[PDB]
Amino acid sequence: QTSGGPVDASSEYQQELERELFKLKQMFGNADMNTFPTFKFEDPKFEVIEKP
Amino acid sequence: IDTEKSQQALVQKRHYLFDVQRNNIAMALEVTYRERLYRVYKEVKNRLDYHISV
Amino acid sequence: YYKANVAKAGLVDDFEKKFNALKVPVPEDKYTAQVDAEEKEDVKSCAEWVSLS
Amino acid sequence: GVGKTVLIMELINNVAKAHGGYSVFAGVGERTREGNDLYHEMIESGVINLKDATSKVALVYGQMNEPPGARARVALTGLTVAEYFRDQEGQDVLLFIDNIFRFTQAGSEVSALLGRIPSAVGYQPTLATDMGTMQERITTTKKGSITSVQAIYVPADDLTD
Ligand SMILES: Nc1ncnc2c1ncn2[C@@H]1O[C@H](COP(=O)(O)OP(=O)(O)O)[C@@H](O)[C@H]1O
Numbered sequence: 199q200t201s202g203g204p205v206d207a208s209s210e211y212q213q214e215l216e217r218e219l220f221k222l223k224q225m226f227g228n229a230d231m232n233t234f235p236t237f238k239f240e241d242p243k244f245e246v247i248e249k250p
Numbered sequence: 251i252d253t254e255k256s257q258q259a260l261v262q263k264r265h266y267l268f269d270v271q272r273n274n275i276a277m278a279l280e281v282t283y284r285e286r287l288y289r290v291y292k293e294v295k296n297r298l299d300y301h302i303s304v
Numbered sequence: 305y306y307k308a309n310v311a312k313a314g315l316v317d318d319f320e321k322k323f324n325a326l327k328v329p330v331p332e333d334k335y336t337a338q339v340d341a342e343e344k345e346d347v348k349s350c351a352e353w354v355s356l357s
Numbered sequence: 358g359v360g361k362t363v364l365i366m367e368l369i370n371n372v373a374k375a376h377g378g379y380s381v382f383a384g385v386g387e388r389t390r391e392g393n394d395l396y397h398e399m400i401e402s403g404v405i406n407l408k409d410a411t412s413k414v415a416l417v418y419g420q421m422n423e424p425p426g427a428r429a430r431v432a433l434t435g436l437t438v439a440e441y442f443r444d445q446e447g448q449d450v451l452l453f454i455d456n457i458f459r460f461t462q463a464g465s466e467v468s469a470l471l472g473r474i475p476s477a478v479g480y481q482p483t484l485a486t487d488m489g490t491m492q493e494r495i496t497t498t499k500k501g502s503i504t505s506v507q508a509i510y511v512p513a514d515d516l517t518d
C-alpha cells in the first residue's frame with residue numbers, strides 16, 4: 199500500500215540520503231551527471247623539424 | 251675512390267631522417283585519435299553506470 | 305545492460321542517440337606534406353653532390 | 358626528548374591553520390603544562406575563539422595525574438568526537454593524539470589488578486587486541502575522512518618494545 203508512498207511512510211532517512219547522494223555524486227564527478235557531456239578536443243603540438 | 255664511394259652509399263642512406271619524423275607524425279595522430287576514442291567512450295559509459303549506481 | 309537496468313525516463317535512449325550520431329574529430333595531418341617537400345629538396349641537394357663526387 | 362611534541366605542534370600549526378575541517382586534539386596521559394601551552398597558543402592563534410564561536414578545534418585532555426582508567430579512555434573520548442565530526446557531518450577531520458603509548462601503558466597499570474597473567478615485557482595479555490579495537494576506529498571511511506597524527510612514545514629508544 200504505497201500508492202502515494204514513495205518510500206512507504208518513512209518520515210525520515212532523507213536527512214542522510216542527501217548525504218549519500220552527495221558523496222556518491224561527488225565521487226563520480228562534479229558536473230551535472232544528468233545531462234549529456236559536451237566535448238572539447240585538443241590537437242598535439244609540433245615544432246620546426248626541417249633541417250635548420 | 252673507396253672513401254668517395256663510401257660517401258655515396260651514405261648519401262643514399264640519408265632518407266632515414268625523413269621517414270622517422272613521418273613515422274612520429276603518423277603515430278602521434280593515431281594516438282590522439284585513439285585517446286579521443288577511449289575518452290569519449292569511457293565518459294559516456296560513466297554517466298550510464300552512475301545512473302545504475304544511484 | 306543499460307536498456308533494462310535504468311528506471312530513468314528514457315534518458316538512456318538520448319545519450320545513446322547522441323552517441324551513435326556523434327562525430328569524433330579525426331585529426332588531420334597538417335605536418336607531413338611540409339616534411340615531404342623538405343625531403344624532395346634534400347634529395348636534390350644529395351643528387352647534385354653525388355654527381356660532383 | 359627527541360621532538361615528538363614540537364613536530365606535532367608544527368604539524369598543527371601548518372596543516373590545521375591551512376585546514377578547514379574541524380581539527381580535534383586528544384592529550385592522552387601527557388604533561389598538563391603542555392596542555393595549557395597548546396590551549397593558549399591556539400587561543401592566540403585564532404584557532405580557538407572564546408567569543409563569536411567560529412572555533413575549529415575540540416580539545417580532550419586526560420593527563421599524567423589521572424588514574425589509569427582515565428588515561429586509557431581519554432583516547433576513546435577524543436576518537437568519539439572526531440568520529441561524530443566524520444560521520445554525522447561528512448567533514449574532513451584532523452585527529453592529533455599525544456601520546457598514544459600512554460593509552461597502552463594505562464592498560465598495563467590495571468592488568469594484574471584485573472586478575473590477568475602478564476605477557477612479555479610486563480604488558481597486558483590483551484595488548485594487540487585493545488590497540489586494534491581502538492585504532493581501527495581511527496580511519497577514513499566512505500562517509501568521511503580522518504587524517505590522524507599520533508605521537509608514539511618509544512620507551513628507552515627501543516622500537517622493539
Ligand atoms: N624541531 C626542533 N627544533 C629545535 N629544538 C627542538 C626541536 N624538537 C625538539 N627540540 C628540542 O628537544 C627538546 C624536546 O622536545 P619535545 O617536543 O618535548 O620531545 P618529546 O615530545 O619527544 O618529549 C625540546 O625542548 C627542544 O629543546
Ligand SMILES: [Mg+2]
Nearest residue numbers: 361362363387
Ligand atoms: Mg612530548
